[PDB]
């Protein structure tokens, strides 16, 4: 009696590798926050009047 792995084996199937799409996490990103846009002005009427 001999084991099943003692004889050479050939794959009769046509392998098809399937790599699922990895999960992705999106982080917040802004070129200019609303605070930066407000600060872009040279003068602010609110602060000047205050």
């Amino acid at each position: 009696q001999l084991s099943r792995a003692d004889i050479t084996t050939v794959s009769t199937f046509i392998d098809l590798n399937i790599t699922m799409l990895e999960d992705h996490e999106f982080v917040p990103l802004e070129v200019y926050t609303r605070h930066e846009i407000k600060d872009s002005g040279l003068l602010d009427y609110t602060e000047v009047q205050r």
Binding site: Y32, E36, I37, D39, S40, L42
Partner: protein, 50 residues
């Protein structure tokens, strides 16, 4: 870069205020007030304030 160049500065001025007052029999009234911001000379900013 939209942020304006921010730097610290010190202002020096005198609030010159000359008012005209009319004295009645039983009351006082301001016939005119002249407010002006007079600048401080370099000699005073250096030899007196600083």
């Amino acid at each position: 870069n939209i942020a304006p160049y921010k730097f610290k500065a010190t202002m020096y001025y005198k609030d010159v205020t000359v008012s005209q007052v009319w004295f009645g029999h039983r009351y006082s009234q301001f016939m005119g007030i002249f407010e002006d911001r007079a600048p401080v000379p370099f000699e005073e900013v250096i030899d007196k304030i600083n």
